[PDB]
Each structure stands twice: as structure tokens, then as C-alpha cells.
Design a protein around this ligand. Structure first.
Ligand code: HEM
Length: 108
């Protein structure tokens, strides 16, 4: 870890305002622009069923952990050139820590 637990409540509202437009986090939630994130931690990328991922993200084969995730959020196209994820990134560590604390709980 190089990822410090933040505030899950602060994390939830980041999600709502920066990620809800393309993703759901609930168990049984649907895929939208972006795939559903239920159970993404400890799972490699491009593996949710019934979702058309890029070749890019598939091949990348990232194993998603709090630390991988933090780098990805920093800058998504920079981390996985080729990705269709349209997000510029979360530059502040504090914001990323919060959001990951939230994702950690919500996708379990
Ligand atoms: C900071 C908020 C966000 C979070 C936590 C998030 C998280 C992620 C993660 C973890 C993946 C990879 C999924 C996998 O490997 O199963 C992903 C992929 C994706 N996200 Fe997001 N994302 C966010 C913002 C957005 C937004 C706002 C959009 C839509 C404008 C978006 C669109 C996508 C797309 C299209 C992909 C598929 C990538 C590809 O196939 O190349 N994401 N997202």
C-alpha cells in the first residue's frame, strides 16, 4: 500500500459526480457507457460479461487493486493507451483515496 484509506462518504459523492454518468457499482447493476463495477477488485481488466471492451484494456490485463486503480484514475489514457474510457483523471491523491475507499466498500 501507497494508498491510504480516505472518507467513504466523500468518496460516494465523487463517484456520483465524476463516475455515475458512465457506471453503476451495484450487484446486478447494468452496464451503461461503462461496465458495471461490482466485483472489480482482485479481477483483471476487460472481464465483465456482455460488455464490448477495447482491445486495449483487454490486453493490458491489469489486476485491479487499490494501488493500480489509483494510478489509473490519475490518468486513464496515460495508463492504458487505447482505452475508450473518456475521463481526464483525478489529480489529487486525497480525492483518489476517498473515491477508492468508497469503491472498495461499494463493489464488494
Ligand atoms: C472517476 C470515475 C470512474 C471510475 C471509478 C471508473 C472506473 C473504471 C474502471 C475500473 C474501468 C475498467 C473496467 C474493467 O476492467 O472491468 C473503467 C472502464 C471504462 N470506463 Fe470508467 N470510470 C470512471 C469514469 C468514467 C466515465 C465518466 C466514463 C464515461 C464518460 C467512463 C467510461 C468507461 C469506459 C467506456 C470504460 C471501458 C474502457 C475500454 O473498454 O477501453 N468511465 N472505468
Amino acid at each position: 500500500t501507497e494508498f491510504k484509506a480516505g472518507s467513504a462518504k466523500k468518496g460516494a459523492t465523487l463517484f456520483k459526480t465524476r463516475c455515475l454518468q458512465c457506471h453503476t457499482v451495484e450487484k446486478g447493476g447494468p452496464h451503461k457507457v461503462g461496465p458495471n463495477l461490482h466485483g472489480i477488485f482482485g479481477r483483471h481488466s476487460g472481464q465483465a460479461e456482455g460488455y464490448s471492451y477495447t482491445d486495449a484494456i483487454i490486453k493490458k490485463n491489469v489486476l485491479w487493486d487499490e494501488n493500480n486503480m489509483s494510478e489509473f484514475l490519475t490518468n486513464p489514457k496515460k495508463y492504458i493507451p487505447g482505452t475508450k474510457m473518456a475521463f481526464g483523471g483525478l489529480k489529487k491523491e486525497k480525492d483518489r483515496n476517498d473515491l477508492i475507499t468508497y469503491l472498495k466498500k461499494a463493489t464488494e
